[PDB]
Coordinates of C-alpha atoms in Angstrom, one line a residue:
Chain A
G9 CA 8.7 27.5 -10.4
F10 CA 12.4 28.6 -10.3
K11 CA 14.2 25.8 -8.4
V12 CA 13.6 23.6 -11.4
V13 CA 17.3 23.3 -12.2
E14 CA 17.9 22.6 -8.5
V15 CA 15.2 19.8 -8.5
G16 CA 16.4 18.3 -11.7
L17 CA 19.9 18.1 -10.4
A18 CA 18.7 16.3 -7.3
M19 CA 16.7 13.8 -9.3
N20 CA 19.8 13.2 -11.5
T21 CA 22.0 12.8 -8.5
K22 CA 19.7 10.1 -7.2
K23 CA 20.0 8.1 -10.4
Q24 CA 23.8 8.2 -10.1
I25 CA 23.4 7.0 -6.5
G26 CA 21.2 4.3 -7.8
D27 CA 24.0 2.9 -9.9
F28 CA 26.4 3.3 -7.0
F29 CA 24.4 0.9 -4.8
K30 CA 23.6 -1.4 -7.8
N31 CA 27.4 -1.8 -8.5
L32 CA 28.2 -2.1 -4.8
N33 CA 26.4 -5.4 -4.0
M34 CA 26.7 -8.7 -5.9
Chain B
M1 CA -11.8 -10.4 -34.5
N2 CA -8.3 -9.3 -35.3
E3 CA -5.5 -11.5 -36.8
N4 CA -4.5 -12.5 -33.3
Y5 CA -7.5 -14.6 -32.3
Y6 CA -8.9 -17.9 -33.7
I7 CA -12.0 -20.0 -33.0
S8 CA -12.8 -23.7 -33.3
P9 CA -14.9 -24.8 -35.0
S10 CA -14.4 -22.2 -37.9
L11 CA -16.2 -18.9 -37.8
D12 CA -17.7 -20.4 -41.0
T13 CA -18.6 -23.8 -39.6
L14 CA -20.4 -22.0 -36.7
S15 CA -22.3 -19.8 -39.1
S16 CA -24.0 -22.7 -40.8
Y17 CA -25.1 -24.3 -37.5
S18 CA -28.9 -24.7 -37.0
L19 CA -30.4 -22.0 -34.9
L20 CA -31.0 -25.0 -32.6
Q21 CA -27.6 -26.6 -32.6
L22 CA -26.1 -23.2 -32.0
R23 CA -27.0 -23.8 -28.4
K24 CA -25.2 -27.2 -28.0
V25 CA -21.9 -26.1 -29.5
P26 CA -19.4 -28.6 -28.0
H27 CA -15.6 -28.3 -27.9
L28 CA -15.6 -24.6 -28.4
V29 CA -12.0 -23.1 -28.4
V30 CA -11.1 -19.5 -28.5
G31 CA -7.5 -18.3 -28.4
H32 CA -4.9 -15.6 -28.9
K33 CA -2.0 -16.7 -31.0
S34 CA 0.5 -15.1 -28.6
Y35 CA -1.1 -15.2 -25.1
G36 CA -3.0 -18.5 -24.7
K37 CA -6.5 -20.1 -25.1
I38 CA -9.6 -21.2 -23.4
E39 CA -11.2 -24.6 -24.1
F40 CA -14.8 -25.1 -23.0
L41 CA -15.2 -28.6 -21.5
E42 CA -19.0 -28.4 -21.6
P43 CA -21.5 -27.6 -24.3
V44 CA -21.8 -23.9 -25.0
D45 CA -24.8 -21.8 -26.0
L46 CA -23.8 -19.3 -28.7
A47 CA -27.4 -18.2 -29.4
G48 CA -27.9 -14.5 -29.3
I49 CA -24.2 -13.8 -29.6
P50 CA -22.4 -12.2 -32.6
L51 CA -19.9 -14.9 -33.6
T52 CA -17.2 -12.3 -34.1
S53 CA -17.4 -11.1 -30.5
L54 CA -15.8 -14.3 -29.2
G55 CA -12.8 -12.9 -30.9
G56 CA -11.7 -10.0 -28.7
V57 CA -15.0 -8.6 -27.4
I58 CA -16.3 -11.4 -25.2
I59 CA -13.1 -13.4 -24.7
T60 CA -10.0 -11.4 -24.5
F61 CA -6.3 -12.2 -23.9
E62 CA -3.3 -10.2 -22.7
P63 CA 0.0 -11.2 -21.2
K64 CA -0.6 -13.8 -18.4
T65 CA -4.3 -12.8 -18.3
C66 CA -7.6 -14.0 -19.8
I67 CA -10.6 -11.7 -19.5
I68 CA -14.2 -12.9 -20.3
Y69 CA -17.0 -10.4 -20.9
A70 CA -15.5 -6.9 -21.0
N71 CA -16.8 -4.4 -18.5
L72 CA -20.5 -4.8 -17.5
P73 CA -21.0 -8.6 -17.6
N74 CA -24.2 -9.8 -19.2
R75 CA -24.6 -11.7 -15.9
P76 CA -24.6 -15.2 -17.5
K77 CA -26.0 -17.6 -15.0
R78 CA -24.1 -20.8 -14.3
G79 CA -24.4 -23.3 -17.1
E80 CA -25.8 -20.6 -19.3
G81 CA -24.4 -19.5 -22.6
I82 CA -20.7 -19.3 -21.9
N83 CA -20.6 -19.5 -18.1
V84 CA -19.5 -23.1 -18.1
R85 CA -16.4 -25.2 -17.1
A86 CA -13.3 -24.6 -19.2
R87 CA -9.6 -25.2 -19.5
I88 CA -7.5 -22.1 -19.7
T89 CA -3.9 -22.1 -21.0
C90 CA -1.5 -19.1 -20.4
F91 CA 1.8 -18.8 -22.2
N92 CA 5.0 -17.5 -20.6
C93 CA 4.0 -17.6 -16.9
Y94 CA 7.6 -18.0 -15.7
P95 CA 8.8 -16.8 -12.3
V96 CA 10.2 -13.3 -12.3
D97 CA 13.6 -12.0 -11.1
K98 CA 12.9 -9.3 -8.5
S99 CA 15.8 -7.0 -9.5
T100 CA 15.1 -7.1 -13.2
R101 CA 11.4 -8.0 -13.5
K102 CA 12.5 -10.3 -16.3
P103 CA 11.3 -14.0 -16.7
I104 CA 13.5 -16.7 -15.0
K105 CA 13.4 -19.5 -17.5
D106 CA 15.7 -21.9 -15.7
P107 CA 13.7 -25.0 -14.5
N108 CA 15.7 -25.4 -11.3
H109 CA 15.8 -21.9 -9.7
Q110 CA 14.5 -21.5 -6.2
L111 CA 11.5 -19.6 -7.6
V112 CA 10.5 -22.5 -9.7
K113 CA 9.5 -24.9 -6.9
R114 CA 7.8 -22.0 -5.1
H115 CA 6.2 -20.7 -8.3
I116 CA 4.5 -24.0 -9.0
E117 CA 3.6 -24.4 -5.3
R118 CA 1.9 -21.0 -5.6
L119 CA 0.0 -21.9 -8.7
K120 CA -1.3 -25.0 -7.1
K121 CA -3.0 -22.8 -4.5
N122 CA -6.5 -22.4 -5.9
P123 CA -7.0 -18.6 -6.7
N124 CA -10.4 -19.7 -7.9
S125 CA -8.6 -21.6 -10.8
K126 CA -7.8 -25.3 -10.3
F127 CA -4.2 -26.1 -11.2
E128 CA -3.8 -28.7 -13.9
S129 CA -0.2 -28.2 -15.0
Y130 CA 2.9 -26.0 -15.3
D131 CA 5.8 -26.7 -17.7
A132 CA 9.0 -25.5 -16.2
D133 CA 10.6 -25.0 -19.7
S134 CA 7.6 -23.8 -21.7
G135 CA 6.4 -21.6 -18.9
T136 CA 3.0 -22.7 -19.9
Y137 CA 0.5 -22.7 -17.2
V138 CA -2.8 -24.7 -17.5
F139 CA -5.7 -24.6 -15.1
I140 CA -9.4 -25.4 -14.9
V141 CA -12.3 -23.0 -13.9
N142 CA -15.8 -24.3 -13.2
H143 CA -17.5 -21.2 -14.5
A144 CA -15.9 -19.1 -17.3
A145 CA -17.8 -15.9 -16.5
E146 CA -16.9 -15.5 -12.9
Chain C
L7 CA 8.1 10.5 34.9
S8 CA 6.1 7.4 35.6
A9 CA 4.7 9.3 38.6
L10 CA 2.4 11.5 36.5
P11 CA -1.4 11.5 37.5
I12 CA -2.6 10.6 34.0
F13 CA -0.8 7.3 34.1
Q14 CA -2.0 5.7 37.3
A15 CA -4.4 2.8 36.6
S16 CA -7.0 0.7 38.3
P23 CA -6.8 -2.9 26.7
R24 CA -4.4 0.0 27.2
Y25 CA -3.0 2.5 24.7
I26 CA -0.9 5.6 24.8
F27 CA -0.1 8.2 22.1
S28 CA 1.7 11.5 22.0
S29 CA 1.4 14.6 19.8
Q30 CA 3.2 17.9 19.0
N31 CA 6.8 16.7 19.7
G32 CA 5.9 14.5 22.7
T33 CA 4.2 17.5 24.3
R34 CA 0.6 16.1 24.5
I35 CA -0.3 12.7 25.9
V36 CA -3.4 10.6 25.2
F37 CA -4.1 7.6 27.4
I38 CA -6.8 5.0 26.9
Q39 CA -8.0 2.7 29.7
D40 CA -11.4 1.2 30.7
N41 CA -13.1 2.8 27.7
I42 CA -12.0 6.3 28.9
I43 CA -9.8 8.7 27.0
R44 CA -7.4 10.7 29.1
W45 CA -5.5 13.6 27.5
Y46 CA -3.0 15.9 29.1
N47 CA -0.9 18.7 27.6
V48 CA 2.4 18.7 29.4
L49 CA 3.0 22.5 28.8
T50 CA -0.6 23.7 29.1
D51 CA -2.6 21.9 31.7
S52 CA -2.2 21.3 35.5
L53 CA -4.7 18.4 35.4
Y54 CA -5.6 15.8 32.9
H55 CA -9.1 15.3 31.5
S56 CA -11.4 12.4 30.7
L57 CA -14.2 11.3 28.4
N58 CA -15.7 8.0 29.1
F59 CA -17.0 6.4 25.9
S60 CA -18.3 3.1 27.2
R61 CA -21.7 4.4 26.2
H62 CA -20.6 4.4 22.6
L63 CA -18.0 1.5 22.6
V64 CA -16.7 -1.0 24.9
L65 CA -13.3 -2.3 23.7
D66 CA -12.1 -5.9 23.7
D67 CA -8.5 -7.1 23.1
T68 CA -9.4 -7.7 19.5
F69 CA -9.6 -4.0 18.7
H70 CA -6.7 -1.9 17.3
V71 CA -6.5 1.8 18.0
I72 CA -4.4 4.4 16.2
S73 CA -3.9 8.1 16.5
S74 CA -3.6 10.8 13.8
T75 CA -0.1 12.3 13.9
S76 CA -1.8 15.7 14.7
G77 CA -3.1 13.9 17.8
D78 CA -6.6 15.3 17.2
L79 CA -8.2 12.0 16.2
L80 CA -8.3 8.4 17.4
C81 CA -9.4 5.5 15.2
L82 CA -10.6 2.3 17.0
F83 CA -11.4 -0.7 14.9
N84 CA -11.6 -4.5 14.6
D85 CA -12.3 -6.8 11.7
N86 CA -15.9 -5.6 11.5
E87 CA -16.2 -1.9 12.4
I88 CA -14.4 1.4 12.6
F89 CA -14.9 4.3 15.1
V90 CA -13.3 7.7 14.9
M91 CA -13.3 9.9 18.0
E92 CA -12.1 13.5 18.5
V93 CA -9.7 14.0 21.5
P94 CA -11.4 16.9 23.4
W95 CA -8.4 19.1 23.5
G96 CA -9.5 22.5 24.8
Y97 CA -12.6 21.2 26.7
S98 CA -12.3 20.7 30.4
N99 CA -15.7 19.7 31.7
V100 CA -17.2 17.3 29.2
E101 CA -20.5 16.5 30.9
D102 CA -23.3 17.4 28.5
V103 CA -24.4 14.0 27.0
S104 CA -25.0 16.1 23.8
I105 CA -21.5 17.5 23.9
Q106 CA -19.9 14.1 24.5
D107 CA -21.7 12.6 21.5
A108 CA -20.2 15.5 19.5
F109 CA -16.8 13.7 19.9
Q110 CA -18.1 10.6 18.0
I111 CA -17.2 11.7 14.5
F112 CA -17.5 8.6 12.3
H113 CA -18.6 5.0 12.3
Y114 CA -18.6 2.2 9.8
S115 CA -19.4 -1.6 9.8
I116 CA -18.9 -4.0 6.9
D117 CA -22.5 -5.1 7.5
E118 CA -23.5 -1.7 6.1
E119 CA -23.1 -3.1 2.7
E120 CA -25.6 -5.3 0.8
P123 CA -20.2 -11.8 1.1
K124 CA -18.7 -9.1 3.2
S125 CA -14.9 -8.8 3.4
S126 CA -13.5 -8.0 6.9
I127 CA -11.1 -5.2 7.9
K128 CA -7.4 -6.1 8.0
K129 CA -5.8 -2.7 8.5
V130 CA -6.7 1.0 8.9
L131 CA -4.5 4.1 8.4
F132 CA -5.2 7.9 8.6
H133 CA -4.2 9.6 5.3
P134 CA -1.0 11.6 6.4
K135 CA -2.0 14.6 4.3
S136 CA -5.8 15.0 4.6
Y137 CA -7.0 18.4 5.9
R138 CA -8.3 18.0 9.4
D139 CA -7.3 14.3 9.3
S140 CA -10.6 13.7 7.6
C141 CA -9.5 10.7 5.6
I142 CA -9.1 7.0 6.6
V143 CA -7.6 4.3 4.4
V144 CA -9.1 0.8 4.9
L145 CA -7.5 -2.4 3.7
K146 CA -9.8 -5.5 3.7
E147 CA -9.2 -9.2 3.3
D148 CA -10.4 -8.3 -0.1
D149 CA -7.0 -6.8 -0.9
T150 CA -9.4 -3.9 -1.6
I151 CA -8.3 -0.5 -0.3
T152 CA -11.0 2.1 0.6
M153 CA -10.9 5.8 1.5
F154 CA -13.6 7.2 3.7
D155 CA -14.2 10.9 4.2
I156 CA -14.8 11.1 8.0
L157 CA -16.3 14.6 7.7
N158 CA -18.7 14.3 4.7
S159 CA -21.6 11.9 4.0
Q160 CA -22.1 13.7 0.6
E161 CA -19.0 11.7 -0.4
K162 CA -19.4 8.0 -1.5
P163 CA -16.3 6.1 -0.3
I164 CA -13.7 5.4 -2.9
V165 CA -12.6 1.9 -3.6
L166 CA -9.3 1.2 -5.2
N167 CA -7.9 -2.2 -6.3
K168 CA -11.3 -3.6 -6.9
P169 CA -11.7 -7.3 -7.7
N170 CA -11.4 -8.4 -11.3
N171 CA -13.2 -10.9 -13.5
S172 CA -9.8 -12.1 -14.9
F173 CA -8.1 -15.5 -14.8
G174 CA -4.4 -16.1 -15.0
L175 CA -1.6 -14.2 -13.1
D176 CA -1.6 -10.6 -11.8
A177 CA -5.0 -9.2 -12.7
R178 CA -4.6 -6.6 -9.9
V179 CA -2.6 -6.6 -6.6
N180 CA -3.5 -9.6 -4.4
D181 CA -2.4 -10.8 -1.0
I182 CA -1.5 -7.5 0.6
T183 CA 0.1 -7.9 4.0
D184 CA 0.9 -4.3 4.8
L185 CA 0.4 -0.7 3.8
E186 CA 2.6 2.3 4.3
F187 CA 2.6 5.9 3.1
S188 CA 5.6 7.4 1.5
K189 CA 6.9 10.5 3.3
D190 CA 6.1 12.4 0.2
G191 CA 2.4 12.2 1.3
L192 CA 1.1 11.4 -2.2
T193 CA 2.2 7.8 -2.5
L194 CA 0.9 4.6 -0.9
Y195 CA 3.2 1.6 -0.9
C196 CA 1.7 -1.9 -0.7
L197 CA 3.6 -5.0 0.3
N198 CA 2.0 -8.2 -1.2
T199 CA 2.8 -11.9 -0.8
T200 CA 1.6 -13.5 -4.0
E201 CA 5.2 -14.3 -5.0
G202 CA 7.1 -14.2 -1.7
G203 CA 6.9 -10.5 -1.5
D204 CA 6.8 -7.5 -3.7
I205 CA 6.1 -3.8 -3.6
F206 CA 3.4 -1.9 -5.5
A207 CA 2.3 1.7 -5.3
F208 CA -0.6 4.0 -5.8
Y209 CA 0.6 7.4 -7.1
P210 CA -1.2 9.6 -6.5
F211 CA -3.2 8.3 -3.5
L212 CA -5.1 11.5 -2.6
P213 CA -7.8 12.3 0.1
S214 CA -10.7 14.6 -0.8
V215 CA -9.0 17.7 0.6
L216 CA -5.2 17.6 0.5
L217 CA -3.0 19.1 3.2
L218 CA -0.2 20.8 1.3
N219 CA 2.1 23.6 2.4
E220 CA 3.8 26.0 0.0
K221 CA 7.2 24.3 0.2
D222 CA 5.7 20.9 -0.7
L223 CA 3.4 22.3 -3.4
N224 CA 6.3 23.8 -5.2
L225 CA 8.4 20.7 -4.8
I226 CA 6.0 18.5 -6.8
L227 CA 5.4 21.2 -9.3
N228 CA 9.1 21.5 -10.0
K229 CA 9.6 17.7 -10.1
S230 CA 6.7 17.7 -12.6
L231 CA 8.4 20.3 -14.7
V232 CA 11.7 18.5 -14.7
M233 CA 10.0 15.4 -16.2
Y234 CA 8.0 17.3 -18.7
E235 CA 11.3 18.7 -20.1
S236 CA 12.8 15.2 -19.8
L237 CA 10.4 14.1 -22.6
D238 CA 11.8 13.1 -26.0
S239 CA 10.4 11.0 -28.9
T240 CA 11.7 7.6 -27.9
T241 CA 9.8 8.1 -24.7
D242 CA 7.0 5.5 -24.5
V243 CA 3.6 6.9 -25.6
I244 CA 1.8 5.7 -22.4
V245 CA 4.5 7.3 -20.2
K246 CA 4.4 10.6 -22.2
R247 CA 0.7 10.7 -21.6
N248 CA 1.0 10.3 -17.8
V249 CA 3.8 12.8 -17.5
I250 CA 1.7 15.4 -19.3
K251 CA -1.3 14.4 -17.2
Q252 CA 0.8 14.8 -14.1
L253 CA 1.9 18.3 -15.1
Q254 CA -1.7 19.3 -15.9
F255 CA -2.9 18.0 -12.6
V256 CA -0.2 19.5 -10.4
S257 CA -0.8 22.8 -12.3
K258 CA -4.5 22.7 -11.5
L259 CA -3.6 22.0 -7.9
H260 CA -1.4 25.1 -7.9
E261 CA -4.3 27.1 -9.2
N262 CA -6.8 26.2 -6.5
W263 CA -4.4 25.9 -3.6
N264 CA -5.6 27.9 -0.6
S265 CA -2.4 29.4 0.9
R266 CA -4.0 30.5 4.1
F267 CA -5.0 27.0 5.0
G268 CA -2.3 25.2 3.1
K269 CA -4.9 22.9 1.6
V270 CA -6.5 22.2 -1.8
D271 CA -9.7 20.3 -2.9
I272 CA -9.4 17.2 -5.0
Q273 CA -12.2 16.1 -7.3
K274 CA -13.3 12.4 -7.2
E275 CA -12.1 12.0 -10.8
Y276 CA -8.4 12.4 -9.8
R277 CA -8.7 10.0 -6.9
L278 CA -9.3 6.8 -8.9
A279 CA -5.8 5.5 -9.6
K280 CA -4.5 2.1 -10.7
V281 CA -1.7 0.4 -8.9
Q282 CA 1.8 0.6 -10.3
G283 CA 4.3 -2.3 -9.9
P284 CA 5.8 -4.6 -9.1
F285 CA 8.8 -2.4 -8.1
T286 CA 12.2 -3.7 -9.1
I287 CA 14.3 -4.4 -6.0
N288 CA 17.9 -4.3 -7.1
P289 CA 20.0 -6.2 -6.1
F290 CA 17.6 -8.7 -4.5
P291 CA 19.2 -11.1 -1.9
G292 CA 19.1 -14.7 -3.1
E293 CA 18.4 -16.2 0.3
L294 CA 15.1 -14.3 0.6
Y295 CA 13.5 -16.1 -2.4
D296 CA 12.9 -18.8 0.2
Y297 CA 11.0 -16.5 2.6
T298 CA 8.1 -14.1 2.6
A299 CA 7.9 -10.4 3.2
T300 CA 6.1 -9.4 6.4
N301 CA 6.0 -5.6 6.9
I302 CA 6.9 -2.4 5.2
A303 CA 7.9 0.9 6.8
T304 CA 8.9 4.3 5.7
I305 CA 11.7 6.2 7.5
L306 CA 12.5 9.8 7.0
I307 CA 16.2 10.7 6.4
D308 CA 16.1 14.5 6.3
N309 CA 13.7 17.4 5.9
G310 CA 13.1 17.2 2.2
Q311 CA 11.0 14.1 1.9
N312 CA 14.0 11.8 1.4
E313 CA 13.2 8.4 2.8
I314 CA 14.2 4.7 3.1
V315 CA 11.8 1.9 2.5
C316 CA 12.1 -1.0 5.0
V317 CA 10.8 -4.5 4.5
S318 CA 10.5 -7.5 6.9
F319 CA 11.0 -11.1 6.0
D320 CA 10.3 -14.6 7.5
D321 CA 14.0 -15.1 8.2
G322 CA 14.0 -12.3 10.7
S323 CA 15.8 -10.2 8.0
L324 CA 15.4 -6.6 7.0
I325 CA 16.2 -4.9 3.7
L326 CA 16.7 -1.1 3.6
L327 CA 15.8 0.2 0.2
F328 CA 16.2 3.5 -1.7
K329 CA 14.0 4.8 -4.6
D330 CA 16.4 6.1 -7.2
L331 CA 14.0 6.9 -10.1
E332 CA 11.2 9.5 -10.1
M333 CA 7.8 7.9 -10.6
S334 CA 5.1 9.5 -12.7
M335 CA 1.5 9.7 -11.6
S336 CA -0.8 7.1 -13.3
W337 CA -4.6 6.6 -13.2
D338 CA -5.7 4.3 -16.1
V339 CA -2.7 2.3 -17.2
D340 CA -3.0 -1.3 -16.0
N341 CA 0.3 -2.9 -14.9
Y342 CA 2.0 0.4 -15.3
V343 CA 5.6 0.1 -14.3
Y344 CA 8.0 2.9 -15.0
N345 CA 10.7 4.1 -12.8
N346 CA 9.2 1.8 -10.3
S347 CA 12.7 1.2 -9.1
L348 CA 14.2 0.4 -5.6
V349 CA 17.8 -0.2 -4.8
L350 CA 19.1 -2.3 -1.9
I351 CA 21.4 -0.3 0.4
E352 CA 21.7 -2.8 3.3
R353 CA 20.4 -6.0 4.8
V354 CA 20.0 -6.5 8.5
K355 CA 19.6 -10.1 9.9
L356 CA 18.1 -9.9 13.4
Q357 CA 17.6 -13.7 13.5
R358 CA 14.5 -13.1 15.6
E359 CA 10.9 -13.4 14.6
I360 CA 10.0 -9.8 13.6
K361 CA 6.4 -9.1 14.7
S362 CA 6.2 -5.5 13.6
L363 CA 8.0 -2.3 12.5
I364 CA 7.4 1.1 14.1
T365 CA 8.6 4.7 13.6
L366 CA 8.4 7.9 15.6
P367 CA 8.2 11.0 13.4
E368 CA 10.4 12.8 15.9
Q369 CA 13.5 10.7 15.1
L370 CA 15.0 10.6 11.6
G371 CA 16.8 7.5 10.3
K372 CA 15.7 5.3 13.3
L373 CA 13.4 2.3 13.2
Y374 CA 12.0 0.2 16.0
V375 CA 11.7 -3.5 15.4
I376 CA 9.5 -5.5 17.7
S377 CA 10.8 -9.1 17.7
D378 CA 9.4 -11.7 20.1
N379 CA 10.7 -10.4 23.4
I380 CA 12.8 -7.5 22.4
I381 CA 12.3 -4.0 21.0
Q382 CA 15.4 -3.2 19.0
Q383 CA 16.3 0.0 17.4
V384 CA 18.0 0.0 14.0
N385 CA 19.8 3.4 13.6
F386 CA 21.0 4.1 10.1
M387 CA 21.9 7.8 10.5
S388 CA 25.5 6.8 10.3
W389 CA 25.2 6.6 6.6
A390 CA 21.8 8.1 5.9
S391 CA 22.9 11.6 7.0
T392 CA 25.7 11.6 4.4
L393 CA 23.3 10.1 1.8
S394 CA 21.0 13.0 2.0
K395 CA 23.8 15.5 1.9
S396 CA 25.1 14.2 -1.4
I397 CA 21.5 14.0 -2.8
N398 CA 21.0 17.7 -1.8
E399 CA 24.6 18.8 -2.7
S400 CA 24.7 16.7 -5.9
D401 CA 28.1 15.3 -4.9
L402 CA 28.6 11.5 -4.9
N403 CA 32.1 11.5 -3.5
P404 CA 31.2 11.4 0.2
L405 CA 29.6 8.0 -0.5
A406 CA 33.0 6.5 -1.5
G407 CA 34.2 4.4 1.4
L408 CA 31.2 4.8 3.7
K409 CA 30.2 1.6 5.3
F410 CA 26.5 1.1 5.1
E411 CA 26.1 -0.6 8.5
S412 CA 23.3 0.4 10.8
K413 CA 23.7 0.6 14.6
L414 CA 21.6 -2.1 16.1
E415 CA 20.5 -1.6 19.7
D416 CA 18.3 -3.4 22.3
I417 CA 15.8 -1.0 23.7
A418 CA 14.0 -3.3 26.1
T419 CA 12.6 -6.7 26.9
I420 CA 8.9 -7.1 26.2
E421 CA 6.3 -9.8 26.5
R422 CA 3.3 -8.4 24.7
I423 CA 4.0 -6.3 21.6
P424 CA 3.9 -2.9 23.4
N425 CA 2.4 0.4 22.5
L426 CA 5.2 3.0 21.9
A427 CA 5.1 6.8 22.3
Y428 CA 7.7 9.6 22.3
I429 CA 7.4 11.9 25.3
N430 CA 9.4 15.1 25.5
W431 CA 9.7 15.9 29.2
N432 CA 11.8 18.7 30.8
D433 CA 14.4 18.7 28.1
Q434 CA 14.6 14.9 27.9
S435 CA 13.0 12.9 25.2
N436 CA 11.8 9.5 26.3
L437 CA 10.1 6.4 25.1
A438 CA 6.9 5.1 26.8
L439 CA 6.4 1.4 26.5
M440 CA 2.9 0.4 27.3
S441 CA 1.5 -3.1 27.8
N442 CA -1.4 -4.8 29.4
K443 CA 0.5 -5.2 32.6
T444 CA 3.1 -2.4 32.5
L445 CA 4.0 1.2 31.6
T446 CA 7.7 1.8 31.3
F447 CA 9.7 4.9 30.3
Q448 CA 13.2 5.0 28.9
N449 CA 15.7 7.7 27.8
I450 CA 16.2 8.4 24.2
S451 CA 19.4 10.0 22.8
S452 CA 18.6 13.0 20.5

């Protein structure tokens, strides 16, 4: 497919969002 | 039988046993140096069994688990061969922290009390003991191959 | 309008389909179906001759609204709603609507049925997932006897802890369509997952087919040498499999056949729930639900607990498919976004496909609606726009709202009538309708 960079970016964003919520609650 | 397992009596001692007394083998113990062991509390019949299979073929250990008779069980009937009462010991069976999946080794954590209470609930394996510090879990099963 | 002919009565169920456009009503062992935009009269098909229901039976509908599944702890029935037929008289034609049957007595110690679900992505809704007291999960192909049922999470001859997943209380499909989440109780509550959990003929549109192909390519590229050998194997297998799907995908039907070999998969888990609330270690997980956040398969996993509490979770890591690997864990990661204490005994969780970010919680006498689109809408924007900033500040608090007072866990249904979406609350004794915003 093409969208590969687009998909990889989304997957990577989700990881970053994972840390956000980890370092948001005690 | 890799360096991980060990049998009692010696694989040697067992070799010299009379073709007859290789059916009344008492106090048989097979274990994995890192995972745990199984002690048969009833005489065992090792006739027709390659003494090196008890190593990691017939009796196998893995973290928190003990598997007897790899896929396709010889169908040992109760009280036959190895299908007999035994005491199984599993090392490092501590409660796990849900956000890490790591072992909780503190003897007073909420999970402890509940963990033990869970073990005592017969999952076809009668609870004998659990050491909060060791994380060692001991239980009895009436028939090894089941 | 509660003054619609199909509703007047004298076990009762009600379901809707196609954006609350088609209604299915069960009463006195008769199926009533009416298409709000197409018919002028409703129709019926009395099935007493094939099955007389008792209050012990549960009945569910396929989302497409073409099939009904009626079951109890012993047997399962699958009937086809006669959409399109008007005069179903022929005894031969009425039997045509009896599509599948199964009893546990059909097998040679028989474990009873605990729960049944249609596979969300099976072509023609031909696949039903059955969970037994066994903790065994089985997939039946409703339309093909030349298919021996597939049994996953089979019992083991192991001793010690965690041979396989035990004590499953609930099951729920991910909105991705390829994953099955399991909520077990062995240790107070944990989440496991079957990825992939495929039917014999997978429903897959072009958009979705390319999404899993691309995700598969991103992970294949993500491979390096430190990567665990077992993981590397799965990722490569995943890419090989998804590529083969792409090669046999039938675009005109948006479906693809899946060989029995690729359907035997071993459970992954337990998932990490970070950060897990300390209080909850003293309680047990009750239900699990999946709620859609946008139109790109982004979802929130919801779990119930003894303390009348709710934890809204988010999966941050991308899982890899796995078939052999025992106790495979890997990116089996969930993150806690919010906790909702309803201080009521939660008897069940329900969702209506037509409403994103909304969840119905049936407590003891209330039907509340947790609405988390306040934050969820922003959450998907940042995921899709790769911008974390918006998240800064956002208060992750869901709008709680009392929908209605009940007495018997009602049957819900979304009904779109004359530009007004509504919620039909069905119970033994009643049939209420209520306005729904959006």
